[PDB]
Amino acid sequence: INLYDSFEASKKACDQLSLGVAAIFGPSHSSSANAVQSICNALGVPHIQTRWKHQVSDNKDSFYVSLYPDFSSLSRAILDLVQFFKWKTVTVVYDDSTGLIRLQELIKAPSRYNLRLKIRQLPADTKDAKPLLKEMKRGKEFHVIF
Amino acid sequence: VLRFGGIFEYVESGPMGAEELAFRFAVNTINRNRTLLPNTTLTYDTQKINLYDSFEASKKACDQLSLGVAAIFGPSHSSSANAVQSICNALGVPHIQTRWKHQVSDNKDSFYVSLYPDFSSLSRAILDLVQFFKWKTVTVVYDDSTGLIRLQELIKAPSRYNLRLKIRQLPADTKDAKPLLKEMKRGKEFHVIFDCSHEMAAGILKQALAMGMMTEYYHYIFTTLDLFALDVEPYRYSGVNMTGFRILNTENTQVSSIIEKWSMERLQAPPKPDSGLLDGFMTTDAALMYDAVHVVSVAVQQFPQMTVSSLQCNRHKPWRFGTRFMSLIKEAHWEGLTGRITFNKTNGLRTDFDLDVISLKEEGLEKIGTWDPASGLNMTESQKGKPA
Amino acid sequence: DCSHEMAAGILKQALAMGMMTEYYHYIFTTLDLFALDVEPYRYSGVNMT
Ligand SMILES: *[C@@H]1O[C@H](CO)[C@@H](O[C@@H]2O[C@H](CO)[C@@H](O[C@@H]3O[C@H](CO[C@H]4O[C@H](CO)[C@@H](O)[C@H](O)[C@@H]4O)[C@@H](O)[C@H](O[C@H]4O[C@H](CO)[C@@H](O)[C@H](O)[C@@H]4O)[C@@H]3O)[C@H](O)[C@H]2NC(C)=O)[C@H](O)[C@H]1NC(C)=O
């Protein structure tokens, strides 16, 4: 299948259910994962997710599992690692916009502790980290979370 | 003779949702005026959709395309609008979005136009407002985990300027925000940016009035655009600093007449006076849906050869007149209820608009300045002290 | 120093005017303070006596 065509995901899931399968191993892509989750929850099909996706809390689907570890516990581990290292200034660099939804309580950590924070975002081009790394050098910031 | 695919969420209530009634009001008010589309009438097909079932949205969109529509009007949820956007991008029919949704940068779609103001421009307006108000420690309080990407230009803003952002999350209910407000009071927080619905804004205002937060020491900024529909009667004499944004251009007399004409039809629907909200006010979603139907009709008026054909979901033949009609959509300059309407030529998002900076005085809610993406922030009250 | 009805109206108008902070310690000479509904006036740091 192609990239980010959830209509094609629904069509090929309909074709595989027309064949009939015991379970569906879904994609690693968020819109197609949401479409296949609606498909399987409305049809009584077990569906497996292997990559993390953004989950809407108001969605009432319970017909899926996510074998990727939940990123809230990873953020708890990252906060415990930062609190072990006794850091005070932490720069956070994220590429996709869902990383802020991923890194939740790391952003919420200055409310709970004495940890000053600043974030920066990578641009859409891969090579253009040189102004970002130049900003890291110019800011004298020695603790980078990627 | 054309048809429009309306997809709206139903409640098993007395009246419908305000989006569906605004859609019917838009169709009736456009078909009443012979100035707009004099040689072609407009029909529609509403569909009542469930709570977060994008497969059911896909099936009802497939039924609407089996009927065949000129254009579709998507729902407010993120997942169902993503499914409708994928289906309409595959079949070439235009898709019009009213609620903001999260977009993925790696999604190569072009058959979608959202008339909601972009939260990057809204966050830049919030950054201009907080730089005018000269705060240093701002607490940003968001509603749900999708609220961070609506404020992601604000959280990147302390890279460039001296600003502290202790960011806190609202709990699962608004009535359980009392420990959050105790933690807010204990931390000596005084400048709070709220990003939620207007219902959650009224709930957090009642919770703060139970908490005694509204003194002279507190400034509240709201990212929501339904601030004018709130009830500020038991808050105005307390002497506080509530400040928000109003996309709805209520200054114009014809716009206010259209608002009153829709509001008298809303009087069949009773209000809930215990919620702390007013009644007889057009929401931003309903006004944006009305303006969306107006912009689509303006795009129809430049197309004399318009023909609606049926389509099938099992074959990927696109609609025939999709490209020229989509080109007619993205060059519109129609003056609606929300002022100027002009989409981006690269995204289709409405990233250029006009904003009314409304604040709270003891007289009531009052406009004190204008905001635009080009000149930034005007502030007509502070512009009165302009020397020669 | 008033009746409890006037005291309740005064407290409602003072809550409407934002007089319910930690910096207010109102003492009521009336003997019917217990008859007031103190539930909206709680969690505000006032000290009714
Ligand atoms: C199935 O799904 C449910 C729902 O998500 C999970 O329940 C959550 O489990 C996590 C496990 O970490 C819980 O997180 C922990 O919460 C503890 C209690 O939090 C208090 O304080 C917060 C903030 O004020 C309140 O919101 C909350 O109500 C409590 O008053 C914390 O004490 C824990 O912190 C500890 O561990 C971290 C690890 O990094 C340390 O850094 C801390 O110092 C501390 O030692 C932690 O945050 C979460 O609260 C649970 N939520 C709910 C709804 O129950 C289940 O765990 C999951 N699987 C299971 C086993 O059922």
Ligand SMILES: *[C@@H]1O[C@H](CO)[C@@H](O[C@@H]2O[C@H](CO)[C@@H](O[C@H]3O[C@H](CO[C@H]4O[C@H](CO)[C@@H](O)[C@H](O)[C@@H]4O)[C@@H](O)[C@H](O[C@H]4O[C@H](CO)[C@@H](O)[C@H](O)[C@@H]4O)[C@@H]3O)[C@H](O)[C@H]2NC(C)=O)[C@H](O)[C@H]1NC(C)=O
């Ligand atoms: C279609 O969408 C495109 C993507 O959003 C639009 O492109 C972007 O438009 C904005 C409009 O404001 C441009 O402005 C932003 O960037 C400038 C310049 O900042 C410079 O330094 C940054 C790093 O510090 C760089 O990242 C930038 O690229 C640039 O080199 C800022 O000055 C702007 O803020 C100013 O304007 C806003 C709005 O009035 C104020 O609120 C601010 O206070 C400030 O005065 C913005 O941050 C942006 O450069 C441009 N590029 C992109 C891709 O972001 C495009 O305009 C839009 N077109 C249509 C038709 O809608």
Ligand SMILES: *[C@@H]1O[C@H](CO)[C@@H](O)[C@H](O)[C@H]1NC(C)=O
């Ligand atoms: C905002 O707060 C300041 C505090 O000094 C006050 O002077 C000003 O009048 C307030 N403005 C509003 C909008 O209430």
Ligand SMILES: *[C@@H]1O[C@H](CO)[C@@H](O)[C@H](O)[C@H]1NC(C)=O
């Ligand atoms: C701001 O508003 C005033 C109102 O007279 C207008 O003249 C001016 O051009 C506007 N633009 C500026 C200077 O922000």
Ligand SMILES: *[C@@H]1O[C@H](CO)[C@@H](O)[C@H](O)[C@H]1NC(C)=O
């Ligand atoms: C008011 O009541 C509170 C209750 O905890 C108490 O702590 C305080 O000392 C009292 N007096 C004040 C605020 O002057």
